Amino acid sequence: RADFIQFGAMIHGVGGTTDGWRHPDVDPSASTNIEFYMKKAQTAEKGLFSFIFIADGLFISEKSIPHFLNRFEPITILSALASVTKNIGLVGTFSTSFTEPFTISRQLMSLDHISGGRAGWNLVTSPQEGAARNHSKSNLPEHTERYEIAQEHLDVVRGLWNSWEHDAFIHNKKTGQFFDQAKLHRLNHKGKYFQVEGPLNIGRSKQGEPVVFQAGSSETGRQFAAKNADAIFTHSNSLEETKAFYADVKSRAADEGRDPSSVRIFPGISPIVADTEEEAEKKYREFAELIPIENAVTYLARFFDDYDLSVYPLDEPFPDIGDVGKNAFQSTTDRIKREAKARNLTLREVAQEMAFPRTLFIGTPERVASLIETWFNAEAADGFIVGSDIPGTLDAFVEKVIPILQERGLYRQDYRGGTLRENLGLGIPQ
Amino acid sequence: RADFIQFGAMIHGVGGTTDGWRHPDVDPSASTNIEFYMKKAQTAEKGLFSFIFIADGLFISEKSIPHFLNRFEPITILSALASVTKNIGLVGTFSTSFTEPFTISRQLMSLDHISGGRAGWNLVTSPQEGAARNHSKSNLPEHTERYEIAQEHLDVVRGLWNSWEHDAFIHNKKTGQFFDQAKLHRLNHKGKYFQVEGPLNIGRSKQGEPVVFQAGSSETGRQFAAKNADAIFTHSNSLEETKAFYADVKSRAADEGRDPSSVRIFPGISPIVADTEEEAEKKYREFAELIPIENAVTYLARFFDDYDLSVYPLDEPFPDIGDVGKNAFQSTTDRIKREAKARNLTLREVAQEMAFPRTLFIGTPERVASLIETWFNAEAADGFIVGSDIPGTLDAFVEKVIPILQERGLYRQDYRGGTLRENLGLGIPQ
Numbered sequence: 001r002a003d004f005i006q007f008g009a010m011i012h013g014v015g016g017t018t019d020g021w022r023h024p025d026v027d028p029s030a031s032t033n034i035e036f037y038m039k040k041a042q043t044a045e046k047g048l049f050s051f052i053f054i055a056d057g058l059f060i061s062e063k064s065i066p067h068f069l070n071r072f073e074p075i076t077i078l079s080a081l082a083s084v085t086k087n088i089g090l091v092g093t094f095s096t097s098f099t100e101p102f103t104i105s106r107q108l109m110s111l112d113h114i115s116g117g118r119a120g121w122n123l124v125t126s127p128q129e130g131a132a133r134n135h136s137k138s139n140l141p142e143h144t145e146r147y148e149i150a151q152e153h154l155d156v157v158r159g160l161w162n163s164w165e166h167d168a169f170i171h172n173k174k175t176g177q178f179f180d181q182a183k184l185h186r187l188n189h190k191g192k193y194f195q196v197e198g199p200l201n202i203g204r205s206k207q208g209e210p211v212v213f214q215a216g217s218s219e220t221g222r223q224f225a226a227k228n229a230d231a232i233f234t235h236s237n238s239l240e241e242t243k244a245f246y247a248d249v250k251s252r253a254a255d256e257g258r259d260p261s262s263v264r265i266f267p268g269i270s271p272i273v274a275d276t277e278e279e280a281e282k283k284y285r286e287f288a289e290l291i292p293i294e295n296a297v298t299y300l301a302r303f304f305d306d307y308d309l310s311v312y313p314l315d316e317p318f319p320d321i322g323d324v325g326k327n328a329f330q331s332t333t334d335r336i337k338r339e340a341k342a343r344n345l346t347l348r349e350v351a352q353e354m355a356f357p358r359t360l361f362i363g364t365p366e367r368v369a370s371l372i373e374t375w376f377n378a379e380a381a382d383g384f385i386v387g388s389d390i391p392g393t394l395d396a397f398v399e400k401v402i403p404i405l406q407e408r409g410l411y412r413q414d415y416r417g418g419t420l421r422e423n424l425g426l427g428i429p430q
Numbered sequence: 431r432a433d434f435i436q437f438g439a440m441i442h443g444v445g446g447t448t449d450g451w452r453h454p455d456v457d458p459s460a461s462t463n464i465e466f467y468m469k470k471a472q473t474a475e476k477g478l479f480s481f482i483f484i485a486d487g488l489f490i491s492e493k494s495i496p497h498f499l500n501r502f503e504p505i506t507i508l509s510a511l512a513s514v515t516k517n518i519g520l521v522g523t524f525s526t527s528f529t530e531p532f533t534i535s536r537q538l539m540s541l542d543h544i545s546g547g548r549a550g551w552n553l554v555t556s557p558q559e560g561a562a563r564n565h566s567k568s569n570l571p572e573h574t575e576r577y578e579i580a581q582e583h584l585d586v587v588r589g590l591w592n593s594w595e596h597d598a599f600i601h602n603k604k605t606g607q608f609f610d611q612a613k614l615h616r617l618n619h620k621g622k623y624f625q626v627e628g629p630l631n632i633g634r635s636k637q638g639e640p641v642v643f644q645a646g647s648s649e650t651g652r653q654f655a656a657k658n659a660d661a662i663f664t665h666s667n668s669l670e671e672t673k674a675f676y677a678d679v680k681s682r683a684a685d686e687g688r689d690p691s692s693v694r695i696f697p698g699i700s701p702i703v704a705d706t707e708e709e710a711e712k713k714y715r716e717f718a719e720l721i722p723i724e725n726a727v728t729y730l731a732r733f734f735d736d737y738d739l740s741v742y743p744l745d746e747p748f749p750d751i752g753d754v755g756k757n758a759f760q761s762t763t764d765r766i767k768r769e770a771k772a773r774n775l776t777l778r779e780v781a782q783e784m785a786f787p788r789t790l791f792i793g794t795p796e797r798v799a800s801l802i803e804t805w806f807n808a809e810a811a812d813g814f815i816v817g818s819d820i821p822g823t824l825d826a827f828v829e830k831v832i833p834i835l836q837e838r839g840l841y842r843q844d845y846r847g848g849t850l851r852e853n854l855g856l857g858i859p860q
């Protein structure tokens with residue numbers, strides 16, 4: 001592999017779980033704490049990370065996780081972070097389902113100008129049915145139609161980004177010609193879902209226009225990402241699954257007539273790094289133990305529930321519960337029984353691990369760096385998006401894993417440049 | 431008057447004119463120059479200004495002024511400026527015509543959290559017919575209906591801001607109660623124009639919720655501002671007109687059952703401050719002279735056009751042109767003829783002044799401070815929104831006028847507090 005691996009940092013307030021915020025080290029106000037976001041962003045920039053990433057959603061209930069209840073909105077926090085960072089990308093989730101493309105186009109391009117060409121857009125078709133009812137709609141469109149809407153939305157956004165050629169603004173004080181009128185282009189778009197005349201009232205950025213990220217995993221979504229995205233998010237459930245996703249999406253991109261190397265695949269990992277195997281495992285256990293055990297056992301009960309687990313002593317080995325009642329959830333139950341027997345887990349531990357599974361990327365910096373290199377060399381990844389809910393795991397990753405990857409020649413010593421496109425290794429499409 | 435006068439700073443890139451950008455001192459890239467915006471914002475904060483203000487529009491053509499062609503978008507530039515300012519308010523224009531209230535509510539409240547309670551919203555019903563065609567509409571609603579839409583939009587935005595009570599987030603790690611469910615409130619709004627269930631996914635800010643600004647001047651708009659706004663923008667065409675506007679809007683606010691002192695009126699002025707009367711006049715003339723004279727004379731020709739002005743020597747006195755062809759534009763033409771005779775203006779000078787009129791607020795700091803005090807004491811203003819297109823006029827205002835108003839006891843020595851509500855003298859509505 002002639003290329004270097006890249007990382008993004010997902011900054012996610014008090015985190016992705018129901019009860020992680022209860023750890024002594026967590027600031028339960030993190031999700032609306034500007035200092036927290038700034039510190040995390042600057043830590044990722046110290047690690048030469050290609051970008052930070054702000055995930056988003058548009059509907060909550062009393063049962064939504066704490067981070068989702070009360071948090072920053074993405075374009076605003078990214079713009080605030082632009083002023084206190086230098087080279088790191090600024091990638092935010094925005095939905096195609098509700099907001100007009102002119103608005104999204106303008107806000108992303110303005111962020112691109114504020115930041116000197118670091119903006120990115122994680123394009124999502126909102127999957128949250130209730131979000132429709134926050135935006136004056138009775139219901140969401142069906143899955144397939146959501147991706148039709150998204151294609152038109154994206155086409156308009158990119159069309160509007162190209163309203164002005166890169167050299168349109170000649171600013172000639174002597175002649176009074178502020179712009180070259182031949183370099184201005186109206187979109188004049190009249191489609192099924194959007195009608196947008198243009199032109200956009202902001203020109204090209206220092207990277208041309210923002211970078212597009214996408215996370216589709218269905219048949220439709222994978223094809224949409226391969227057709228449209230500069231970078232693609234995916235999961236890291238197993239090396240084998242992630243390798244297959246990578247190859248499939250790269251093949252789709254070729255089918256769409258693109259160079260597959262122009263499509264950068266980033267699986268998400270949440271590594272737990274510590275100086276010893278035992279210290280990392282301790283940190284995992286500290287977090288896994290936070291879940292109210294009754295809630296975890298009840299959720300565990302799902303995969304069995306031919307039994308009442310509240311009979312069994314929590315601190316005795318997981319019972320030999322087992323009845324093939326169809327394959328109702330038997331692919332999982334078999335997995336659960338295996339791991340419980342393999343590591344002699346108690347009922348309590350099984351419940352805790354099901355509520356908060358143990359990452360593969362746990363242990364010493366050398367181990368975690370080696371696994372990352374293995375996934376990279378196996379073409380499971382062009383980089384990773386790194387979650388850091390557990391306090392200190394971003395710091396530990398930057399301080400201890402990055403230098404190993406640098407020493408091994410898999411990671412740069414310095415930022416490639418000042419724009420997101422340059423640091424991802426992409427060109428500017430003007 | 432027991433209260434102090436307040437100022438806002440309108441930051442407007444290369445400015446509000448067609449040709450001001452051609453002055454030697456102007457940076458023609460100002461409208462997308464982050465440094466320019468940051469410098470202006472910090473200058474206003476040095477002057478203890480209550481807020482900065484970002485105006486906006488959503489439609490352009492080849493004839494739009496240079497600033498409108500290529501500029502920052504408001505929520506993004508305000509959020510970026512939040513990170514490099516401390517106490518000064520952050521007020522942006524957003525339209526009720528196109529964007530959904532959930533989005534606007536979220537973005538403003540997120541800015542309010544990022545900035546520690548400095549956000550403000552200048553609510554406008556977009557008057558630009560072409561903006562409709564940038565947002566998948568055939569045309570704008572009629573004027574009256576635009577204000578009906580705006581009322582519902584604002585009601586939903588404010589409703590959503592109150593999804594969470596100020597003390598809802600108890601963050602009790604020991605019990606696991608992250609929030610008090612009794613302090614969460616769904617909007618469940620089902621109106622003519624919007625249907626928005628809620629709740630909003632961000633809580634109360636340090637000033638409760640953002641401050642609402644409005645600039646309505648029609649019968650309908652004045653009533654809407656008196657009913658809804660915390661602060662109102664208006665013009666400064668003459669002391670008499672602005673006094674009448676002030677009294678009218680304060681009376682309307684009482685009719686709506688509000689305390690008129692809770693409604694702060696800010697006329698817009700663009701002062702030209704210099705150490706001598708003659709130096710200030712020189713600066714005005716330098717800018718007035720930039721307009722292509724042919725364009726200015728043609729525009730001047732409008733108010734006459736019973737003549738071809740290209741006959742008359744530019745540098746000879748303005749002719750005694752005059753025929754009461756109806757009152758077609760005779761209230762103005764009479765004014766034009768009067769001033770030309772009063773100051774013995776040439777054809778060229780008349781054309782130049784019509785293209786770029788001379789502010790009343792021109793001359794020494796002592797004069798400009800005295801005029802401001804006179805307007806304040808006459809109840810024409812609770813403060814002023816200060817434009818600064820001409821390079822250095824914000825600096826000159828802060829450095830030379832503010833200290834006089836401080837010495838005279840009309841202006842504070844220090845910020846009152848860290849929130850926009852506190853510095854405007856308003857309370858938080860929770």
Ligand SMILES: Cc1cc2nc3c(=O)[nH]c(=O)nc-3n(C[C@H](O)[C@H](O)[C@H](O)COP(=O)(O)O)c2cc1C
Binds near residue numbers: 124127234
């Ligand atoms: C790194 C990563 C980030 C994601 N961010 C979001 C997000 O911000 N908002 C969201 O609704 N879903 C997010 N997802 C979930 C994906 O959107 C979802 O799995 C995918 O869209 C399903 O594919 P489909 O659209 O074809 O159905 C993310 C997934 C990954 C792997």
Ligand SMILES: Cc1cc2nc3c(=O)[nH]c(=O)nc-3n(C[C@H](O)[C@H](O)[C@H](O)COP(=O)(O)O)c2cc1C
Binds near residue numbers: 485663664665815
């Ligand atoms: C200080 C000030 C700021 C203004 N900012 C904007 C603006 O950002 N966008 C806009 O379209 N109009 C702006 N205007 C123009 C007013 O919106 C317009 O004169 C007013 O809405 C007319 O009243 P009406 O809505 O009742 O018709 C501004 C006016 C003033 C005095």
Ligand SMILES: Cc1cc2nc3c(=O)[nH]c(=O)nc-3n(C)c2cc1C
Binds near residue numbers: 057058059128268
């Ligand atoms: C990595 C990942 C992040 C996600 N983030 C959000 C989010 O921020 N808001 C939301 O409503 N849903 C999410 N969802 C559903 C997510 C899903 C995944 C897989």
Ligand SMILES: Cc1cc2nc3c(=O)[nH]c(=O)nc-3n(C)c2cc1C
Binds near residue numbers: 486488489498558698
């Ligand atoms: C003070 C003032 C500011 C304005 N600003 C804008 C603007 O930024 N964009 C726009 O399209 N129209 C404006 N308009 C029409 C304005 C009008 C006034 C009176």
